[PDB]
Amino acid sequence: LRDLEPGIHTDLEGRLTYGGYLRLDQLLSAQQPLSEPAHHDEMLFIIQSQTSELWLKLLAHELRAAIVHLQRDEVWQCRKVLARSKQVLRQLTEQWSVLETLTPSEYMGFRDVLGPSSGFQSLQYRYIEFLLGNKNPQMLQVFAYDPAGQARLREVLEAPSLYEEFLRYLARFGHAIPQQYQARDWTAAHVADDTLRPVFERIYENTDRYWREYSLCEDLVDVETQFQLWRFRHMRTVMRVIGFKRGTGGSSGVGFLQQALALTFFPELFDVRTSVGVDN
Amino acid sequence: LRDLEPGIHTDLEGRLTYGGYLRLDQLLSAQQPLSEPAHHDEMLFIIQSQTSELWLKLLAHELRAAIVHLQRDEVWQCRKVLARSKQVLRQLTEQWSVLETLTPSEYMGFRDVLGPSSGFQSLQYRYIEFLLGNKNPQMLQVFAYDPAGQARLREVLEAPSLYEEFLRYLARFGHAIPQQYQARDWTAAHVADDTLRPVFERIYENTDRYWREYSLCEDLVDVETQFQLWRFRHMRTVMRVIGFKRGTGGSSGVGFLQQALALTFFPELFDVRTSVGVDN
Amino acid sequence: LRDLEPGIHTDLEGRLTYGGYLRLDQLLSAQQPLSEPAHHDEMLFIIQSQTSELWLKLLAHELRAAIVHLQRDEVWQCRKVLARSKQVLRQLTEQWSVLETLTPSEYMGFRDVLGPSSGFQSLQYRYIEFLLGNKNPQMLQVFAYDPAGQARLREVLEAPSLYEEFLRYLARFGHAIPQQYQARDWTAAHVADDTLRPVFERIYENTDRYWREYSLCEDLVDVETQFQLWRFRHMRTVMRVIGFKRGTGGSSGVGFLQQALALTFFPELFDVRTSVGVDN
Amino acid sequence: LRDLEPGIHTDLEGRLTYGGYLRLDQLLSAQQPLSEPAHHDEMLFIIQSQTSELWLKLLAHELRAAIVHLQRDEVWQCRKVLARSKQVLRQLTEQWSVLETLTPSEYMGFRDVLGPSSGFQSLQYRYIEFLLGNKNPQMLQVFAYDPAGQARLREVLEAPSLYEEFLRYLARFGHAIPQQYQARDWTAAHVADDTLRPVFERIYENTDRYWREYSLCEDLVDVETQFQLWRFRHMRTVMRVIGFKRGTGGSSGVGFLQQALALTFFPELFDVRTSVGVDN
Ligand code: HEM
Ligand code: HEM
Ligand code: HEM
Numbered sequence A, B, C, D: 001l002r003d004l005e006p007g008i009h010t011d012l013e014g015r016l017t018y019g020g021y022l023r024l025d026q027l028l029s030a031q032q033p034l035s036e037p038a039h040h041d042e043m044l045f046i047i048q049s050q051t052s053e054l055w056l057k058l059l060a061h062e063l064r065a066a067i068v069h070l071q072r073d074e075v076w077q078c079r080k081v082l083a084r085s086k087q088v089l090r091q092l093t094e095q096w097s098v099l100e101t102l103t104p105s106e107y108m109g110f111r112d113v114l115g116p117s118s119g120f121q122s123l124q125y126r127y128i129e130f131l132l133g134n135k136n137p138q139m140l141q142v143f144a145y146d147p148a149g150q151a152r153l154r155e156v157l158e159a160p161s162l163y164e165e166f167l168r169y170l171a172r173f174g175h176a177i178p179q180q181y182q183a184r185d186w187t188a189a190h191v192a193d194d195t196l197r198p199v200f201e202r203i204y205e206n207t208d209r210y211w212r213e214y215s216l217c218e219d220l221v222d223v224e225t226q227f228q229l230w231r232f233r234h235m236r237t238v239m240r241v242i243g244f245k246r247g248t249g250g251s252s253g254v255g256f257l258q259q260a261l262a263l264t265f266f267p268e269l270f271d272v273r274t275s276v277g278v279d280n
């Protein structure tokens, strides 16, 4: 019904190809279900996590770029990168709707083939957690089988987080940021700091003067909020698929995931809500 | 802040892990930007397409199973598979929002590295179009360089589409379906059949009796609508990124994509809308 | 640029119009901000809640219908009404994205005009909560100021919930549902009932035999999951707008909201996850 | 299961409540179906449109403010309001998924009660259309039945559009904007202007310098894209509900709707895609 237009290239036998550029032979032979006989639902299971890992790879790529922009006081560029980061997190969050068509009786058909394998062992996810600030050195051991993986995590562990680079940015523009944010043991997760309260009150209550800082505060709140949405949707999927069974990874499951939901990446941004006044 | 739970597996050196099961060494080495020097936005571009191909792979996997169910008159199972299929199409549609953060001035930084490559050359996409019924034998020449891919496409070309299998299902349950749907040249795309109008009127106007048929009709309409939504969002993205420039694949671009949006997979389901009356 | 077709009705002076049918004079005169002078953001605030209440009215309309279908063993009809209900709950959940563009310094500009008013006093919301099974007699008093509204809330409180009507449906079809669900004091919130475990294990482990029951089970899990997602997105919005301040309604705020996230509408459906085996 | 905290206001008899503040008595009595006997689906039908009109009211409120900010060179504030406007348009677009659960056989049960009423007679929709730049004087006669309404619509018809106010903003900042945009007959819909091409090339090819203009250009592209998506989803819904029947408003229906999809609010922004080079 749609005729092939003249001008469309067909002899590609020798030029850059779609499959070549996207390395599709490699990409599309990475799905290796283990059930015997084959279980229909295992393909969804694999694809669900693989798409997530691709989005996580991009998210890390963008977040690193956002940090470089902050380091250079390039605010509008940082915000544009963060807008893309938000969209990526939104896709990661939206796609839970697919896996929710998987029932407990379907999953029980192949859960056993997974052995001890678990998202808890996701290097990319932990890399992102660390970069946003949720640094737990306990996680380094989990990755002993992958010394190389452990080393990349150590690297992000030892660098200022996204949030810390934001405070360092604020410091450069006259805000009353404590001196320790210029240099400290970055491997220690940030502890909520009440001396930042007046700093953010001033930004939120004088948006005309501190529009750049204000817009970045709200971006960071967006980023945390969406990440918590991801955690919550994952957790609700776990509840409907395995309920309160222990996880393949060896944790108590839902309870363990709920403990992460109770964490906050950017404590002072949320804390300031209790004291902020009207803008003027 | 979250302490590691006791019981979490960490001696993983000789066991199946997340990364192993999902083949992440292979999956996450498949992104090879060609820009020199590196262009920041090329990683997004690659990931966007690769995630789409992964979803397309799953979509084909599910649609094949839905067809098997239809062949066996397993309606409730067919509907469940179709439900998942809709969610996959929904993800494919939703993710355009990420790519919409790519501006023309960013794209012009690396568009030339793509040469003649184009999603028009996507084997999985064409497989899905053929399976839903949009069979254009002209497309076989796009895949001449890929004997194995051409053969896989030929196979779906030569078998009844999802829609035709639905019509064969209706025939098994006494609906007035022409004999030709029992066996015909399947490689010829379905032509709208006015003798099917009375068939669908009867289903829509007697939903109590033909509830199974009615629900499947609406599933198919859902599937078509979501597919058209994907095409439309893709097309609008093309508009904002390259405007009315010709495509890398050699087509007129937007106009060529608009010609597909003008097509319908399940013509009689939509046609019947003009003549259906009240249910009773 | 688009000419009006001849044939379009333009003289409507004495005929039923769009605005007339939808009562738009009435609908669009119900937004009365109290701020003086008017605060720009107050319109968003009112509209966000009003759109939600309209969706809640429709949700109640649909769920009542689903219950009537259940009472009449009309399963396919019930599922179709539940599908629409799921879409409504999805809109209620998605729209939080609009209100998240409201910042703390913006809100503080008009929060004071609200007095004690709070969504805790949403009659329609509580109606839905009660209908789904979260019954709490302590709420009746909140609506003492509105005896008509209070009475309607008492009515749903006194009738079996959607879940209990599901259990009664199962009883009619041979499932081992305890005698108490035939008639009892419905004003008491349902308590997790261990004797229901065998009932749901059987359904999930023999989906071919019990496809109707299995599909309704998964519909209810869907509804509960989406409702929890609404609560969560509401709670996260509360966090970014007022943080941990006490609510206008007099509660501790986020803490009080978190307590409802711990409630479950359909406890046994989630409980069965721990014991359910492979289907066959 | 959740105890009321002490301190929650339960005696509201004389105080401002949720219902009172939001005028819910007025809002929730605005649903007046005409079917006899009542048709179950008419409620969905009314609510779908009414929620849309509430969002449209908000959208107008925000767009007027965006314009005022524009007139005053307040770019960051303009962009914040536009971001909210985008979210509102996204809700208007997402909610079509609810109405798609309406089947033709359901609709035929009450379509006749509507007479000639149609969304074509939506004053608020037309207001937004006019404000965004698609001005058509032919429309004024449609609201001759509503003199106050017709006049409000004529007012926006004569005022510079959002787009025209953006060009005027560009002219105040040294961009080569033709003299005609300082003053002209605004009732005429904006025609595509080739002399603007070099203006937009300059912006897109020098984003470091023109980051304000670049960001606004892309905001406008965002708004137009989302608006076209609403048109497309509406149109696809019309297709699945009435097919190619003539509309109640007297138009040819789908074909008339498609004609608007070919309209463009910001022609030069899309046009410049064909000539823009790499940014630098
Ligand atoms: C059937 C679906 C799923 C189930 C039942 C499930 C279950 C679990 C459980 C029980 C844990 C805790 C660790 C453990 O004991 O294994 C966990 C953690 C995790 N999962 Fe999943 N999961 C599912 C899907 C997914 C998917 C599709 C992804 C990736 C897209 C994912 C990514 C993660 C991540 C990153 C963690 C670590 C979270 C943290 O450390 O706070 N999970 N999951
Ligand atoms: C910057 C973003 C994109 C642009 C500018 C673009 C442009 C185009 C153009 C011009 C065509 C027509 C064929 C040609 O002349 O090359 C096309 C077709 C196609 N593209 Fe894209 N595209 C984009 C993103 C994507 C993505 C992310 C995918 C995901 C797989 C995709 C999949 C397809 C498919 C399947 C077709 C064939 C459609 C048909 O045959 O009707 N495109 N695209
Ligand atoms: C800035 C926006 C909002 C804030 C700060 C907020 C805050 C709160 C707080 C503090 C409570 C606890 C009761 C109290 O002490 O007042 C609550 C409950 C509630 N809110 Fe909101 N809310 C917001 C928006 C909304 C919207 C738009 C709706 C739309 C329906 C809504 C519906 C409800 C409902 C139904 C409850 C009762 C929940 C329960 O009983 O578990 N809220 N909200």
Ligand code: HEM
Binding pocket: D048, D049, D052, D053, D099, D102, D107, D117, D118, D119, D120, D121, D122, D125, D234, D237, D238, D241, D242, D246, D247, D248, D249, D250, D251, D252, D253, D254, D256, D257, D260
């Ligand atoms: C079953 C649902 C619907 C059907 C069958 C339908 C059908 C139509 C038709 C046939 C037209 C062309 C004018 C005419 O001849 O009447 C139209 C236009 C329009 N409709 Fe709908 N519609 C539906 C739902 C809605 C809803 C829920 C809204 C919410 C606002 C809406 C808003 C509009 C608007 C604003 C136009 C004017 C578009 C333009 O002038 O380009 N419609 N619709």
Ligand SMILES: N[C@@H](Cc1c[nH]c2ccccc12)C(=O)O
Binding pocket: A214, A215, A216, A218, A219, A222, C100, C101, C103, D079, D080, D083, D084
């Ligand atoms: N955070 C929202 C709203 C927003 C847009 N621009 C802003 C500037 C300042 C504060 C908030 C905003 C967003 O990024 O879309």
Ligand SMILES: N[C@@H](Cc1c[nH]c2ccccc12)C(=O)O
Binding pocket: A049, A111, A114, A117, A118, A119, A242, A246, A247, A248, A249, B017, B018, B021, B022
């Ligand atoms: N942790 C999951 C298993 C799992 C979920 N997603 C995965 C992805 C890959 C490997 C394993 C998983 C469970 O307890 O069942």
Ligand SMILES: N[C@@H](Cc1c[nH]c2ccccc12)C(=O)O
Binding pocket: B214, B215, B216, B218, B219, B222, C079, C080, C083, D100, D101, D103
């Ligand atoms: N087509 C919609 C609505 C729907 C659900 N069940 C149905 C049965 C018959 C007709 C339509 C429906 C869906 O699949 O969600």
Ligand SMILES: N[C@@H](Cc1c[nH]c2ccccc12)C(=O)O
Binding pocket: A018, A021, A022, B049, B111, B114, B117, B118, B119, B242, B246, B247, B248, B249
């Ligand atoms: N066809 C696109 C190029 C393109 C889009 N997506 C792709 C994925 C892979 C290779 C090329 C592409 C263009 O005309 O610009």
Ligand SMILES: N[C@@H](Cc1c[nH]c2ccccc12)C(=O)O
Binding pocket: A100, A101, A103, B079, B080, B083, B084, C214, C215, C218, C219, C222
């Ligand atoms: N619960 C999901 C998946 C589903 C569809 N049909 C089913 C039948 C049985 C179990 C689950 C399903 C849905 O309603 O879309």
Ligand SMILES: N[C@@H](Cc1c[nH]c2ccccc12)C(=O)O
Binding pocket: C049, C111, C114, C117, C118, C119, C242, C246, C247, C248, C249, D017, D018, D021, D022
């Ligand atoms: N409870 C909210 C106030 C609120 C939110 N949404 C509302 C809707 C109507 C009236 C009041 C509200 C607070 O503590 O700030």
Ligand SMILES: N[C@@H](Cc1c[nH]c2ccccc12)C(=O)O
Binding pocket: A076, A079, A080, A083, A084, B100, B101, B103, D214, D215, D216, D218, D219, D222
């Ligand atoms: N237009 C997209 C991407 C974007 C964000 N900031 C920008 C600044 C300039 C250009 C584009 C952008 C958005 O608003 O999310």
Ligand SMILES: N[C@@H](Cc1c[nH]c2ccccc12)C(=O)O
Binding pocket: C017, C018, C021, C022, D049, D111, D114, D117, D118, D119, D242, D246, D247, D248, D249
């Ligand atoms: N124009 C629609 C009728 C319609 C759709 N939405 C409406 C809202 C109000 C009044 C009428 C309508 C039709 O031709 O069937």
